[PDB]
Write a protein that binds this ligand. Structure first.
Ligand SMILES: O[B-](O)(O)c1cc2cc(CBr)ccc2s1
Ligand SMILES: [Ca+2]
Ligand SMILES: [Ca+2]
Ligand SMILES: [Ca+2]
Ligand SMILES: [Zn+2]
Ligand SMILES: [Zn+2]
Length: 227
């Protein structure tokens, strides 16, 4: 697409003045998207790429095009598209945060655990002391859906919310990989994510281009048929 930039195996698309989407491919060639946020004098990353080499490519692109230190990364669940690059984040000295449940499931899912655990209230909001100096990232656990551990992130100051692999696009035909999914609670979880970030108009997700809020309602409608 016009305006996109390629660095090695990675493609970046600016979504807002201080937000970019990172896309990595794993062989057909499957795309996974995460986010890069410029918060003042530092950078925040949401999700790794599929692999350590791909994740290092994100870090080098950030140094070349943004030239600000990467303070921390939040990863959205314990699967390869979201945490495959944890060793690269650790080698680069980036503090890593995941849901505690993602850190618990990580060895069983073949992932490396993050250095810190985020915990959540009954209402899905992160307990603030487990998310120190997160700037505009607002972390919400919507309930089990794509996986039991899936978390979501709002970028405060923007129109952007990230559903990760929980949300799928509004023309989708399936919910994608349901092997570790909670079929009963998925619809409610997708709706809870839309309610958490009621004013977000750009919904970014792992396996499609950014969509409108129609991705949330469409994903919930498809999920209703699993219960
Ligand atoms: O459930 B999801 O985090 O969306 C994953 C999709 C996927 C695909 C391959 C081969 Br292409 C290997 C690992 C994973 S994980
Ligand atoms: Ca590794
Ligand atoms: Ca599994
Ligand atoms: Ca039940
Ligand atoms: Zn997954
Ligand atoms: Zn995924």
């Amino acid at each position: 697409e016009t305006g996109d930039q390629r660095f090695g195996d990675l493609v970046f698309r600016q979504l807002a003045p201080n937000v970019w989407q990172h896309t990595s491919y794993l062989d057909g060639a499957v795309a996974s998207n995460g986010l890069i946020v410029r918060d003042g004098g530092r950078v925040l990353v949401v999700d790794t790429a599929w692999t350590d080499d791909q994740t290092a490519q994100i870090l080098n692109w950030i140094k070349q095009e943004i030239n600000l230190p990467v303070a921390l990364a939040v990863v959205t669940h314990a699967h390869q598209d979201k945490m495959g690059g944890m060793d690269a984040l650790h080698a680069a000295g980036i503090a890593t945060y995941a849901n505690a449940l993602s850190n618990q499931l990580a060895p069983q899912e073949g992932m490396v655990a993050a250095q810190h655990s985020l915990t959540f209230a009954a209402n899905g909001w992160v307990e603030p002391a487990t998310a120190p100096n997160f700037g505009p990232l607002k972390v919400f656990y919507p309930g089990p859906g794509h996986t039991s551990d899936n978390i979501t992130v709002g970028i405060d100051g923007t129109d952007i919310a990230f559903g990760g692999c929980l949300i799928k696009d509004s023309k989708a035909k399936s919910l994608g990989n349901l092997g570790d999914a909670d079929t009963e609670h998925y619809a409610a979880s997708a709706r809870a994510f839309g309610a958490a970030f009621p004013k977000a108009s750009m919904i970014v997700m792992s396996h499609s281009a950014p969509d409108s809020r129609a991705a949330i309602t469409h994903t919930a409608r498809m999920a209703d048929k699993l219960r």
